[PDB]
Amino acid sequence: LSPEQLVLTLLEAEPPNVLVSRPSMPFTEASMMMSLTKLADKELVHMIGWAKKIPGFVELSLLDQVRLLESCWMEVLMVGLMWRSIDHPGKLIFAPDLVLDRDEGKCVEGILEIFDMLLATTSRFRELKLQHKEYLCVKAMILLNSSRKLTHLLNAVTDALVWVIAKSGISSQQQSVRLANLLMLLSHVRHISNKGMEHLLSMK
Amino acid sequence: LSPEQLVLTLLEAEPPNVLVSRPSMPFTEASMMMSLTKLADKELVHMIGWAKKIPGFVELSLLDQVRLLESCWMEVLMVGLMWRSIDHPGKLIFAPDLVLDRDEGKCVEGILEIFDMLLATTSRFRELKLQHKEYLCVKAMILLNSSRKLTHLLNAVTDALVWVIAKSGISSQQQSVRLANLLMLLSHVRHISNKGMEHLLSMK
Ligand SMILES: CCCCN(C)C(=O)CCCCCCCCCC[C@@H]1Cc2cc(O)ccc2[C@H]2CC[C@]3(C)[C@@H](O)CC[C@H]3[C@H]12
Ligand SMILES: CCCCN(C)C(=O)CCCCCCCCCC[C@@H]1Cc2cc(O)ccc2[C@H]2CC[C@]3(C)[C@@H](O)CC[C@H]3[C@H]12
Ligand code: NI
Ligand code: NI
Ligand code: NI
Ligand code: NI
Numbered sequence: 001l002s003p004e005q006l007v008l009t010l011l012e013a014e015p016p017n018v019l020v021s022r023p024s025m026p027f028t029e030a031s032m033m034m035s036l037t038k039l040a041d042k043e044l045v046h047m048i049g050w051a052k053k054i055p056g057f058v059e060l061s062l063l064d065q066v067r068l069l070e071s072c073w074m075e076v077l078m079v080g081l082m083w084r085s086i087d088h089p090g091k092l093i094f095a096p097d098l099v100l101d102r103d104e105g106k107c108v109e110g111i112l113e114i115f116d117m118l119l120a121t122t123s124r125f126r127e128l129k130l131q132h133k134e135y136l137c138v139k140a141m142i143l144l145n146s147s148r149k150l151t152h153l154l155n156a157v158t159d160a161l162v163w164v165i166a167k168s169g170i171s172s173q174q175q176s177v178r179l180a181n182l183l184m185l186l187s188h189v190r191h192i193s194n195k196g197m198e199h200l201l202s203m204k
Numbered sequence: 205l206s207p208e209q210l211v212l213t214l215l216e217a218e219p220p221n222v223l224v225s226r227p228s229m230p231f232t233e234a235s236m237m238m239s240l241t242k243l244a245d246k247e248l249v250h251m252i253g254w255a256k257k258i259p260g261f262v263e264l265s266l267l268d269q270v271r272l273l274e275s276c277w278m279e280v281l282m283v284g285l286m287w288r289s290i291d292h293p294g295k296l297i298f299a300p301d302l303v304l305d306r307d308e309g310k311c312v313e314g315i316l317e318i319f320d321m322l323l324a325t326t327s328r329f330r331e332l333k334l335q336h337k338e339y340l341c342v343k344a345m346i347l348l349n350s351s352r353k354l355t356h357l358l359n360a361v362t363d364a365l366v367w368v369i370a371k372s373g374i375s376s377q378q379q380s381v382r383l384a385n386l387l388m389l390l391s392h393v394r395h396i397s398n399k400g401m402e403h404l405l406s407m408k
Pocket of ligand 1: 036037039040041043044045047048069070073077078080081094111114115195196197199200
């Protein structure tokens with residue numbers, strides 16, 4: 001498979017959006033957590049089908065498959081949330097009809113800071129002018145950077161990210177730099193996922 | 205400062221080694237933890253002077269300075285340990301005269317698995333044929349990838365890593381790939397540092 005072809009299959013593998021909605025009345029700690037939780041449940045179902053569409057993922061052992069989805073699922077969700085909210089300052093686009101204002105974060109104890117960390121990282125991706133095609137490779141690298149067919153798969157995604165950056169036309173050095181900047185941003189997603197998780201544990 | 209000049213100052217900023225030694229008798233949980241702990245203490249002193257030699261680090265606010273050293277110190281220590289043990293399968297080179305066999309890990313409860321994670325990541329760096337000059341930039345990127353003079357500093361280190369990879373002579377695409385592989389290895393160091401820390405907490 002060529003890089004371009006790898007990208008095209010990732011593009012077609014995007015999960016469908018989820019059918020949700022904001023309760024008409026003002027959010028409460030209960031209804032906001034109820035909404036986020038139902039949303040994630042449906043996204044988690046679609047995430048499994050998405051990973052199965054990544055070229056070579058189903059050829060991995062069932063155990064490795066489950067292992068990857070299990071250890072980086074909050075990260076895959078957050079980066080999708082960031083991509084969706086990239087062009088909307090102060091807003092988190094959890095789902096097409098589940099758009100939350102930053103200030104709504106005070107509706108839940110301790111979610112405000114997590115919202116703020118998501119908004120900041122999203123702003124960095126915006127400043128970097130992240131492209132939708134680079135978002136697809138970066139998302140697949142989060143799921144896979146955790147040995148043999150796996151390393152092969154990661155390499156393929158990496159060559160697909162490099163091909164996408166080459167098509168932007170900047171210089172060779174600026175292409176390396178851009179690569180380094182995209183990858184260093186994923187470690188920020190890792191950090192916010194760890195805090196979001198602890199935020200969940202203490203909560204439920 | 206040119207990339208080459210940035211590298212040369214990092215090279216001269218390497219901390220001096222520490223004066224330590226193995227107790228003559230066979231290690232016990234107490235004497236192994238005593239040795240590791242004294243070693244780290246002295247390395248932690250030298251780490252502070254090293255960071256102060258990174259071009260632009262002292263111009264950062266005192267608060268940011270302390271913040272960086274405080275959040276990624278175990279990572280900077282582990283990557284130095286990995287570099288030192290790169291050419292020695294089954295051995296962790298904690299210090300010139302503090303060389304531990306893998307099997308000595310059973311001398312302390314729960315250290316065996318941490319030793320094993322360090323040895324595995326070290327083997328990956330060996331397979332990648334990590335160069336000492338790339339090790340210097342990667343180490344400085346761990347300390348700095350955590351806004352303005354900081355971003356400037358990180359960019360400078362990144363351009364220094366890219367310059368070092370260009371001098372290896374591989375193709376443009378293989379240079380991007382190599383960059384992506386070095387950076388993805390640092391996230392493994394992050395993970396082992398988290399486990400080593402928890403291992404310490406539960407312990408002391
Ligand atoms: C997909 C395969 C893995 C499935 N496995 C093994 C699992 O364990 C899944 C476990 C399901 C966990 C149920 C809880 C659902 C998570 C909802 C996340 C909830 C909804 C959500 C949705 C997104 O699309 C992105 C981020 C987020 C989270 C960001 C961080 C928040 C704001 C935290 O601060 C509190 C609420 C969290 C948000
Ligand atoms: C430098 C500025 C930061 C200083 N600050 C704010 C601090 O808090 C420093 C705190 C000092 C912590 C004291 C404990 C010393 C750490 C010794 C680490 C101990 C020695 C050591 C030395 C290395 O050069 C590399 C890794 C390592 C660790 C690897 C992971 C191990 C094997 C764990 O599984 C148990 C022992 C750990 C090893
Ligand atoms: Ni569905
Ligand atoms: Ni939009
Ligand atoms: Ni000294
Ligand atoms: Ni050696």
